[PDB]
Amino acid sequence: VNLEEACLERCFPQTQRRFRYALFYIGFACLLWSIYFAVHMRSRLIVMVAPALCFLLVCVGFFLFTFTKLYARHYAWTSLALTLLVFALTLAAQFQVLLSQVGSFSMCIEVLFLLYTVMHLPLYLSLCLGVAYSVLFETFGYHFRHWELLSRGLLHGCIHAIGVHLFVMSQVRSRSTFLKVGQSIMHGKDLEPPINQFSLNFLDQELERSYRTSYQEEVIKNSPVKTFASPTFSSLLDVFLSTTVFLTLSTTCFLKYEVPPPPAALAVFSAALLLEVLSLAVSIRMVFFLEDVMACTKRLLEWIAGWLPRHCIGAILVSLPALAVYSHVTSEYEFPVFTGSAALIAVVHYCNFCQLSSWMRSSLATVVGAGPLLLLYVLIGQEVVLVFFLLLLLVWFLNREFEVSYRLHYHGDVEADLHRTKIQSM
Numbered sequence: 001v002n003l004e005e006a007c008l009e010r011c012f013p014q015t016q017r018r019f020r021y022a023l024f025y026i027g028f029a030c031l032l033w034s035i036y037f038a039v040h041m042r043s044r045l046i047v048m049v050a051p052a053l054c055f056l057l058v059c060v061g062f063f064l065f066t067f068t069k070l071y072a073r074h075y076a077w078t079s080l081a082l083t084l085l086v087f088a089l090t091l092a093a094q095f096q097v098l099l100s101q102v103g104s105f106s107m108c109i110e111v112l113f114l115l116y117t118v119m120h121l122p123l124y125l126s127l128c129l130g131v132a133y134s135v136l137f138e139t140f141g142y143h144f145r146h147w148e149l150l151s152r153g154l155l156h157g158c159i160h161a162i163g164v165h166l167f168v169m170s171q172v173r174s175r176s177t178f179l180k181v182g183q184s185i186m187h188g189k190d191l192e193p194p195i196n197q198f199s200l201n202f203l204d205q206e207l208e209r210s211y212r213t214s215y216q217e218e219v220i221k222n223s224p225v226k227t228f229a230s231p232t233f234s235s236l237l238d239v240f241l242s243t244t245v246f247l248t249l250s251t252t253c254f255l256k257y258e259v260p261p262p263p264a265a266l267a268v269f270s271a272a273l274l275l276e277v278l279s280l281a282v283s284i285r286m287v288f289f290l291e292d293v294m295a296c297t298k299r300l301l302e303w304i305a306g307w308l309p310r311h312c313i314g315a316i317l318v319s320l321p322a323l324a325v326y327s328h329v330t331s332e333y334e335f336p337v338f339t340g341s342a343a344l345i346a347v348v349h350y351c352n353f354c355q356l357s358s359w360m361r362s363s364l365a366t367v368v369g370a371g372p373l374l375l376l377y378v379l380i381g382q383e384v385v386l387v388f389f390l391l392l393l394l395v396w397f398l399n400r401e402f403e404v405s406y407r408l409h410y411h412g413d414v415e416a417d418l419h420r421t422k423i424q425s426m
Helices: 002-040 046-067 069-097 101-117 123-143 147-191 205-212 214-221 231-256 263-287 295-304 307-318 320-328 338-349 358-376 380-425
Strands: none
Touching: 002 046, 002 069, 002 101, 002 147, 002 380, 046 069, 069 101, 069 123, 101 123, 101 147, 101 338, 101 380, 123 147, 147 231, 147 338, 147 380, 205 214, 205 380, 214 231, 214 295, 214 307, 231 263, 231 307, 231 320, 231 338, 263 295, 263 307, 263 320, 295 307, 307 320, 307 358, 320 338, 320 358, 338 358, 338 380, 358 380
16 A cells, blocks of 8 residues: 555645636536526526526635645545535536436536546435436436436436446556556666647657557557557457447437337438447457457558558447437428437547547537537527537547557656567666
8 A cells, every 4th residue: 555655645636637628617617507596597596597607706715725734634524625615506407407318417427427437425415426426416307396207317328337437447548657657766766748738649650650550569469458558458448348338329319219210210220220330340350359359450450450441340349329319310300309318428438548539539529429410409598508518628638638648658658668678678
């Protein structure tokens, strides 16, 4: 446990810079809602706007608490108080209004994401608080408003599955980087952030070229699966979550029809499933390497492992759950709540596939997860914009934060084995 305590100190600047960004997020989010509430809901203004601006004072008090010595020692406890206080604000917002179900569901999604990824609490405390908050969210709305109740749970389960996967995989990067960065320290002893802010790339073009081929050389060399941070194992968990996110999301949409589903609706789902079953099986052949492996399928396995080809597969794999939502849209739309609330999971799902470029993933969430619903409306109309804009920027920030936490792990891997080679030389 001695190295555990030193690990936290090394990661303390990260758990503080992240936490201070969450305060900016909720402070900005709670200010846009107050402006939206103070104009379109003047019938009950002081009873809903006042919590928004009053809680803005909580962020100010918490932001200054960061510089206090107590935060340098009790950063976990202060992060817990955000989890409880923001829960109270969002749970009461659902109760106080009775606003669209889409607007409330965005609050549940965004607050859940902050707890899982950018709050730094123990897994059992984070997961239990998230489910307890979600079960309180889905129970206050119906109480203070067969198959209809199951659909909300399936969407709720998808949020936790993505959040847990982001949380678990983020601790893997931080811990593995800490071990490998400290591994080089003893190597340099025995011998005697290189990422641009805008494009999220290593400044040295030489590091880019090897990084872009990292998956390919991993497959070509058939290196064994070591930990959860291996480039080929991360793909397996990414596809496995993508299949489950797609399947649970597809189950709810087909529960709405229970007018028969459009021929397109049956076509896209089955086309996705036919593509999906191969993708899950291909990743098996890339990590497990059964005796059924053979030369011809080893030729194609490395080709898919390249930068351009894997981006194409990941782009349609990440967008596969989103394409299930928009395959149910026809001229008989006038459905306005189920499509909107399911689409929030679609844009959220773009946080998965951390290996791919964040800029392409985040952009595709805007055009393939937000654009269709936004244009379908072209005040409910003035709320879907603000609901999606808040969630999109959270997706953009989280994808950015995990991409720099994945390439940094690779930079620690190449730096660790460079020192190891130098040690073997002498």
